[PDB]
Design an enzyme around this catalytic site. Structure first.
Site, PDB file in Angstrom:
ATOM      1  N   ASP A  35       0.811  -1.187   0.000  1.00 60.90           N
ATOM      2  CA  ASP A  35       0.000   0.000   0.000  1.00 60.90           C
ATOM      3  C   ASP A  35       0.866   1.267   0.000  1.00 60.90           C
ATOM      4  O   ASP A  35       0.521   2.264  -0.640  1.00 60.90           O
ATOM      5  CB  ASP A  35      -0.828  -0.008   1.295  1.00 60.90           C
ATOM      6  N   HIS A  39      -3.583  -3.382   5.995  1.00 56.23           N
ATOM      7  CA  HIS A  39      -3.715  -3.637   4.577  1.00 56.23           C
ATOM      8  C   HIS A  39      -5.170  -3.932   4.359  1.00 56.23           C
ATOM      9  O   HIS A  39      -5.541  -5.071   4.536  1.00 56.23           O
ATOM     10  CB  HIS A  39      -2.828  -4.818   4.124  1.00 56.23           C
TER      11      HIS A  39
END
Ligand SMILES: NC(=O)C1=CN([C@@H]2O[C@H](COP(=O)(O)OP(=O)(O)OC[C@H]3O[C@@H](n4cnc5c(N)ncnc54)[C@H](O)[C@@H]3O)[C@@H](O)[C@H]2O)[C@@H](O)CC1
Ligand SMILES: NC(=O)C1=CN([C@@H]2O[C@H](COP(=O)(O)OP(=O)(O)OC[C@H]3O[C@@H](n4cnc5c(N)ncnc54)[C@H](O)[C@@H]3O)[C@@H](O)[C@H]2O)[C@@H](O)CC1
Lengths: 327, 317
Positions: A159, A187
């Site tokens: 990410d 996440h």
């Protein structure tokens, strides 16, 4: 000069493992001067495919590959490990509900937590990739009596790297000139990529892009990225996730750049007020195998709101797993 | 840093492509100080998948990736190319169209000193079509891959003699990537000793040759898929060793256009032992070829000659 380190990788015949192993043996994760012994773990059904992976590793003739072993027992795989990448996790099954996923994972992660505590180096560094990564890292460390909990981390580096890629595109500057990106929380769809402290070539990110863009364009696009890949390729983003895995380990072991930091999900010690114990993604610096959370950043209300939501979601799953007597 | 090089790669949305691209972008092929521009070519029906691969490369945040472009037009992909990795091929006539069009595009739009690696099968013959159809470019800049077979053979020898792979030198694979390629232990050294002093001729011909030739099938039977990662590795090494150079005292296998070396028919793309330095290669000539070796060199040279012939028959070259 350097003696080989042992790197344990579970889920090794899977897609992420297929893009991860070759780059590790080529020396991309720990240095071109550091030989590695790979200790690969699969479930019994996957052992034959794992043997084929082993053949292809031999067929690359990697001078740094000092040893290679495949097994289906966690006590042989983690044996004397210096590093362990826990990529394997329960598959998703039909009508198999959340708690059911939690339970299955709880099983793998308890077992693996125990094995690490019994046979690995005492200062083994652990990365959990298998989802849900934060809660799985929680279950493993809590079942690894004898190991420091701060050696258990979970990946938010994919990410982080997606957020840096979008900012670079938007501001038209090379990705190598974006610094101080942070992804807080985990996440998940609710992760929070933070642009309040980021810099683009020295300038503050928010002087180059506006809040509107930030909040209604940038945030949703980073959160949807994984779905976009799957729609385009028809498969999930394994190469890019293997790359994030390698970076997470490399930056931890070799250190972060001066003036910069990376995102890592680690056991909270109450930094920024986040509850103790949960595995939570923070801005972190590292130097020689150790990291520290970057403290003192000013959190505005926009930030706090988002950070809190994510803390609560993790606190709840922790609740569930406790309720299942997994911890 | 150097100025960026443009690297074109065809078949970019396939299996080899997926294990190849991220290592190139990471600086494994040309070095960590050489930024690269990736120019990716697919067929229009794999364009969607290709955009997905592009997205993943962006998401690696690679500092050396100075540009990335995806296209279904050879003239766009190959423009100002400095290196071209031709991986896509027909799932003879069909390949022939591919390679002539691609050979022509290269001649029109790529750099004059563009280096070309053909991986798509049948690689040696496909390299002949392209070079023949690439009026204006040096035919010796057209090569095919035999490095995978080379690497597999190093692997088997290391394993047999118990020594580390880094101690094996002077492996050669003559001919092509095929069931009848010949992996030569006669000049190879294991830890400075001649290979055949450590290994016997019966193992060589009964165990070693067949096992290297069957290696691709063992992998397919094991994983249920072909050897993409290790083939991508071999392609990276082929380029790297040609661009940077081979180690001192060593050589690599590459299939190049024959200039009569070892008595191999001129014109066919054939695998020899070569050394390289800064972009140019040279065949290792003057090795002693015994009789066991010649027969095998002959066989593969023959087969190649047939396809050549066959290809002329189709008026492809
Ligand atoms: N935290 C993050 O940012 C990300 C997490 N991800 C997670 O990464 C994990 C692996 O993803 P893949 O795409 O490789 O999945 P694959 O299904 O391709 O591979 C999973 C592998 O795990 C193995 N495995 C299962 N249980 C095991 C056990 N008990 N011991 C050893 N190996 C075992 C399986 O046999 C299989 O080979 C998944 O949980 C996925 O959701 C990826 O989505 C990448 C992003
Ligand atoms: N020389 C050697 O040592 C080896 C050669 N090999 C050859 O490598 C090739 C690729 O193998 P993979 O496993 O990737 O194949 P995949 O089928 O996974 O992918 C090949 C790709 O080529 C693309 N393609 C087809 N025609 C094209 C064209 N005109 N322009 C652009 N792209 C085009 C396809 O759309 C596909 O994405 C095959 O021919 C294979 O036989 C590999 O088997 C490795 C070993």
């Amino acid at each position: 000069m350097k003696a080989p380190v042992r790197v344990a990788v579970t889920g090794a015949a899977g897609q992420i493992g297929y893009s991860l192993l070759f780059r590790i043996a080529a020396g991309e994760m720990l240095g071109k001067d550091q030989p590695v012994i790979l200790q690969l773990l699969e479930i019994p059904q996957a052992m034959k495919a794992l043997e084929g992976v082993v053949m292809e590793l031999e067929d690359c003739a990697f001078p740094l590959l000092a040893g290679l072993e495949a097994t289906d027992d966690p006590d042989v795989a983690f044996k004397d490990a210096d590093y362990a990448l826990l990529v394997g996790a329960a598959p998703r099954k039909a009508g198999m509900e959340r708690r059911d996923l939690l339970q299955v994972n709880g099983k793998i992660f308890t077992e693996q937590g125990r094995a690490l505590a019994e046979v690995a180096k005492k200062d083994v560094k652990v990365l959990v990739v298998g989802n849900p990564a934060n809660t799985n890292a929680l279950i493993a460390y809590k079942n690894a009596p004898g190991l420091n909990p701060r050696n258990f981390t979970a990946m938010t580096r994919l990410d982080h790297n997606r957020a840096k890629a979008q900012l670079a595109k938007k501001t038209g500057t090379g990705v190598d000139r974006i610094r101080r990106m942070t992804v807080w929380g985990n996440h998940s769809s609710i992760m929070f990529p933070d642009l309040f402290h980021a810099e683009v070539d020295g300038r503050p990110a928010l002087e180059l892009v506006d809040m509107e863009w930030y909040e209604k364009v940038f945030i949703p696009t980073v959160a949807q990225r994984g779905a976009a890949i799957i729609q385009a390729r028809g498969a999930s983003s394994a190469a890019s996730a293997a790359n994030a895995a390698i970076e997470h380990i490399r930056d931890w072991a070799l250190g972060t750049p001066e003036g910069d930091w990376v995102s890592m999900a680690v056991p909270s010690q109450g930094e920024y007020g986040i509850p103790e114990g949960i595995v939570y993604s923070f801005p972190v610096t590292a130097k020689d195998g150790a990291y520290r959370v970057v403290e003192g950043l000013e959190i505005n209300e926009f930030a706090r709101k988002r950070m809190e939501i994510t803390a609560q979601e993790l606190l709840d799953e922790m609740e569930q797993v406790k309720a299942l007597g997994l911890i």
